Amino acid sequence: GLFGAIAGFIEGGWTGMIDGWYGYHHQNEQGSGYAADQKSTQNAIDGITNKVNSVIEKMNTQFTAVGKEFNNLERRIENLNKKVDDGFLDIWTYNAELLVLLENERTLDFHDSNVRNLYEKVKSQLKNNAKEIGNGCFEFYHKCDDACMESVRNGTYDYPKYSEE
Amino acid sequence: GLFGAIAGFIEGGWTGMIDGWYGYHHQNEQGSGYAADQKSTQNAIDGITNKVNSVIEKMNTQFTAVGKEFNNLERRIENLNKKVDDGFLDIWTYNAELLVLLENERTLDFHDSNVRNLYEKVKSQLKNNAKEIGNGCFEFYHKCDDACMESVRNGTYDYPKYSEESKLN
Amino acid sequence: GLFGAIAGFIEGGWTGMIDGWYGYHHQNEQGSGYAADQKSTQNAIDGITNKVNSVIEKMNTQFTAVGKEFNNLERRIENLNKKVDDGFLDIWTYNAELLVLLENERTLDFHDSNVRNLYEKVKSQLKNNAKEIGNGCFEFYHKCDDACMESVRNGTYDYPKYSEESKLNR
Amino acid sequence: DTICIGYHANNSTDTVDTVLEKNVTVTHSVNLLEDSHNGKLCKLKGIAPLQLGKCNIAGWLLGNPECDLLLTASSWSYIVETSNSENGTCYPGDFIDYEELREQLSSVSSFEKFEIFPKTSSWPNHETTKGVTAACSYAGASSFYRNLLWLTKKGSSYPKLSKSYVNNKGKEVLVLWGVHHPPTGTDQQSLYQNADAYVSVGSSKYNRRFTPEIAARPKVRGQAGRMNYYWTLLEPGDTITFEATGNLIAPWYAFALNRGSGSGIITSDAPVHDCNTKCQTPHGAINSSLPFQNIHPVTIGECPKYVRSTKLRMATGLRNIPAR
Amino acid sequence: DTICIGYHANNSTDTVDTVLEKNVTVTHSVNLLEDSHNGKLCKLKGIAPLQLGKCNIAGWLLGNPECDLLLTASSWSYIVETSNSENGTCYPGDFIDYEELREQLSSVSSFEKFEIFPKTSSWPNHETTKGVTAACSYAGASSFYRNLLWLTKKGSSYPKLSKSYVNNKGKEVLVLWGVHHPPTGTDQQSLYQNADAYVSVGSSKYNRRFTPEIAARPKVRGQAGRMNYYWTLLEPGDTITFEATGNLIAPWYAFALNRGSGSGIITSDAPVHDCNTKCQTPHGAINSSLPFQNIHPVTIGECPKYVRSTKLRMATGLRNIPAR
Amino acid sequence: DTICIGYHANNSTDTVDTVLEKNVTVTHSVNLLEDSHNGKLCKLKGIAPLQLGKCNIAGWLLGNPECDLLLTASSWSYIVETSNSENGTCYPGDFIDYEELREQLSSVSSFEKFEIFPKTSSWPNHETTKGVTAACSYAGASSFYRNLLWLTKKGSSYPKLSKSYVNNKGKEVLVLWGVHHPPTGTDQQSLYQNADAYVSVGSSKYNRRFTPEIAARPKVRGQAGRMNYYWTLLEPGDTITFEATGNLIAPWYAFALNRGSGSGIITSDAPVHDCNTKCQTPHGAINSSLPFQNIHPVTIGECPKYVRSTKLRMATGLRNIPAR
């Protein structure tokens, strides 16, 4: 991964989370579970939707296109016609396959980027109040309840309120 | 932002900083104001200027290109001519429109990376000597006069020296 | 570059390390030396060989393609034929030169990223037990023998093993 | 007390390719390459195609006896020839600018077949029967093109004829005629008398004279003689004058044409069916909103861009890693 | 005591597009698509275009009585036809290989018009006047082409003529002539007095004998007859021989061609102006350094590549977020 | 005790370009652009190419007396013409559909040359000699084409001639002939008797009439008369019939044709040696497995795509910064 997150320092994905691409999985005293991040998932959905739509827009539908007949004294024109149809076919096959290979690479990295950025939005909120294990997990110090867990995914954590460390 | 900086952990831009794409703001006991990082800004202009030019090179000028006439018994060749002109046009509009999308994408992220790298340049200089507030701001522990501020943006910030830093309580 | 590593916070390259693209340099009681990280390199090599093959594989080879003659009353067609040959040439030259530019850009960034991620795997392994000097270097707090050095290049570095670092930490 | 940031995974098996890596299983994706087709030839905007069947454009327009199924045709969404469309020219000869005529037809959605020079009224001084040949027979019976009239001498007297049609149909009229070239001076005499005959055809834009090329050739379908076929598009208001002293295979029926884009001629052996499509290929129809397809380069209607690829799967989701 | 790292921002409202996001406001950008033109037809390299005005290439080269203004033209940067270019062939007939001839002129940057067969010195045994027709009437009287000479019989006499030209111009010479086909045998004699005449043209590479096809055609411009137009490119030093017992529209003026490049023919109703450009389109001139333009696909000079695009704005600065 | 993280460097001076920077020194790189060629013309699939030397296709097939070296030719990998290839049409005239013929010969791998109408037994009622000309001289002595036969009236008498050939060969048969056009009516009779002679050639698909187009012409290579040359592909089991009352340059030899794929006609002065290659260009052969070459557009066999690039170097390693 270009961003070292997916298949990186976060070794695997969660079949458990099913309401988004990126999200969290907390611990609590009040139980465990998964949660999707509307912010970063919707943002990714909009983007990828636009990429697909954009790629398709640049491919204009092929209207009526029929071959032509030539008599036995027009072989030169016939080969010319063939050379043109094959020329264009070669180019459009190349473009299509090539664009997809490239936007697939960029797409995977786009997700890898969103995960890292998400892991960092969290890490930049918590700071001292928790320590970084690995696997993209944070070990709290101040005992965080469901309402506190929410404030994290909410982007409203209120760091100045912990020192129970 | 692919690199998390622009429109990310640094929420907005500075209409104040008017002499560079990237830079600093500092708040001193002597005063405050903006200052752009000549290094990073200039390298970006060199990159972008080179991207635009490269785009333009690859697009060789169109020389004299006009149309041919055909008589009423030459429709097949006329249609070929038309298939050829439309064909080449379809492809160039594609390439053009496309190249611009995929480069605007690279360009916007390019700036993101540049801000990110500038922030992380400062952070690696400061270390213990200041704490990361957020919004891309560092809070010095040690009192940083103009010459000290300038050293930070100069890539020459001292440390150790201001290891009076254990105001870290 | 795009990830700040190569030609960035790691100023230069080591001509001393000849076994791979990225690696480590250790200073130990036992001694010095350069060691290439197998995983990251062989993977990067896997990807780069794949970029090259995937680019070559797209540009399909050219078979028999000669030139047609035209008589003095076939100017228009001859001109069509030229407009075609020149057209396809314009485009394939563009598609080739342009593909190489962008892929070169991506490949240099690819390497940049790989180095970056290698620096941070190690960084998150050590944590307190070492301090970031700056030039992609970590100064140890707990003295690491060759057997320990390997575990760092292994991903199997036992951090809790060293609270000795906490002592030297101050 | 902990919180962990992670990403979505599932039982997806879809693979996409990238420049750096091949076969990467992803959580979500879209296929852009349409590869399923109908296998049938269908209507387009409610209109059916014209099945020529055993005949080709030549047989249909000229009026080859074996193409009588087609005499009723009037409108069509597109034209279809099959592997067995060999019934065209039955009396040996060159169809002059035949290809150009096909190309013209590709942009015709309908016409009105009409009687330009009525058989039993246009030739008082010439024989309008006996103009048959074994070469163009149906059911062992000497016949002839349904749309051309083979004029011959009326009792050793083939007088110079002059017939003009004024095109007032408000549309392009397709006129077809032939020029007969007997194998010997004898045959030339029996058919037309007049060993030195000529055919002179003229309109506002068309001018050409024909003289018989008399010579012995290998026999094609039992004929050493040959018959050249010609055509022109008379414009609204324009007149066409036929002048002959023999050898003229006069026009009996012509076609007032209706122009219409989006039409064309294809060669398919697929079965016609009662269905409506927006895209048609020689292999069948296509009901698809995808951008690409690898079914066939030949296309009629609003179709996906044809391409040579076998796989065009574009990733939308992230790398899929469940790790059981 | 604090220090902040940040990025630029401004009042710019320029937007761009990216694959992932539409309409992104940026700090700086450059437009790559030229959309602005002169509305004027300009000179290229100080050399003005040739305005054919109401005439077309045929009228010009043949010297249609309505194209007298053009008789003076010798050099041009490109040739211009308009929506009113109707004056070409005023006596009915086919201009053989006309399109090819047009194509020829597109590589001609200039020529020297000269009197290949002077009227009052070339034809002592034939009538050099009375070669007019109402089909080509100009300001009242029956006139004719200025570059061709209609040769008629001289007092019931029309002797076989034989005139040759040797190309002493050191470059290709464009020769034009015509072969007349009268409507009736009466007229044939009235003009050429000589019921079975012929025209023969020969050179190193050209060889034809034209025999008149006497027939009555639908009257175009009042003429039941037809005139066919022929042209050839005589090489330097080569000879072209004309022999006719009548029916010859003799070459009077010819053109020694100066080949160039980057020239051509365009259709435009834009006015010519005393201005200079390096790039020209039927809509107007272009003064641009941009790589693309959406003005017109037809182009003369050194122009930006044409493209269908409506917008091609390339981002140079970063994402603009003033949020003040 | 310390551990540092870093990257490879070396003594590499190879540079590459990117969109942001040009001339970046990298540790490793591939060159996708082949720019080195053999400089020779080599065999293909083991078979050497047919060298035409100072002859072109026209002269080789007709049998120009300067192309006697090529009478032995039977099979080839491709056809090579040179700058000195001008010996072809030695009797002034037009080789009709010549370009087409050249195209047809490009998809041919070998042939059998055979005597179709043996000179000694084929024309009893006609003069089998006299048919030589200074224009087509060899060794100083007037001669003629090796594969055509110039027939003339046998003692002031030219009987209408009729000859046929049946294609029992299992291949297409290239049949070439010609039609002579005397300068005047006097010459016409001197040769063919008969003032209104004709040549009619007919097969199952081919039918055409030839009239002597007599006209005054400049002398080319001594000859004021012209000679048009013709050809056709006779299909297996088909008959071709030549009928002529004069002006017929009869066939004498013909060609049974073997169709191959992947071959053609190139112009080159590069020497021919005894070596084999898979890719040949006008400049030389190419022994490369790269995707691109900037050597020459014209290609025969399995070759890299031609392109205009000076340099196509793809970075594989990373930035090289050896700073020691």
Ligand SMILES: *[C@@H]1O[C@H](CO)[C@@H](O[C@@H]2O[C@H](CO)[C@@H](O[C@@H]3O[C@H](CO)[C@@H](O)[C@H](O)[C@@H]3O)[C@H](O)[C@H]2NC(C)=O)[C@H](O)[C@H]1NC(C)=O
């Ligand atoms: C980065 O910024 C710092 C701060 O401006 C630069 O260092 C300072 O440079 C000034 C100008 O030369 C020095 O002032 C001069 O000081 C010497 C002291 O002996 C004396 O001759 C005069 O007072 C003179 O004005 C100043 O000493 C120095 N300050 C510090 C803290 O080093 C530095 O040059 C910049 N570095 C780079 C690489 O651009």
Ligand SMILES: *[C@@H]1O[C@H](CO)[C@@H](O[C@@H]2O[C@H](CO)[C@@H](O)[C@H](O)[C@H]2NC(C)=O)[C@H](O)[C@H]1NC(C)=O
């Ligand atoms: C219509 O087409 C059929 C099929 O091509 C013709 O039948 C062939 O006629 C040829 C020539 O007589 C024979 O050699 C073949 O054996 C026949 N094939 C078949 C399948 O019948 C038929 O003669 C054509 N009829 C007309 C009027 O054109």
Ligand SMILES: *[C@@H]1O[C@H](CO)[C@@H](O[C@@H]2O[C@H](CO)[C@@H](O)[C@H](O)[C@H]2NC(C)=O)[C@H](O)[C@H]1NC(C)=O
């Ligand atoms: C020059 O062109 C004009 C325009 O076509 C000719 O005038 C037309 O002539 C036709 C036939 O006589 C008329 O039906 C049109 O109504 C005329 N239009 C106008 C505007 O007058 C004119 O005759 C041409 N002159 C020559 C010498 O060819």
Ligand SMILES: *[C@@H]1O[C@H](CO)[C@@H](O[C@@H]2O[C@H](CO)[C@@H](O)[C@H](O)[C@H]2NC(C)=O)[C@H](O)[C@H]1NC(C)=O
């Ligand atoms: C074969 O080609 C050569 C070279 O083109 C011909 O030689 C020329 O012949 C003419 C007429 O006799 C001479 O005036 C020229 O000086 C010759 N040119 C050169 C370059 O030598 C030759 O005539 C041709 N022979 C045949 C039989 O076609």
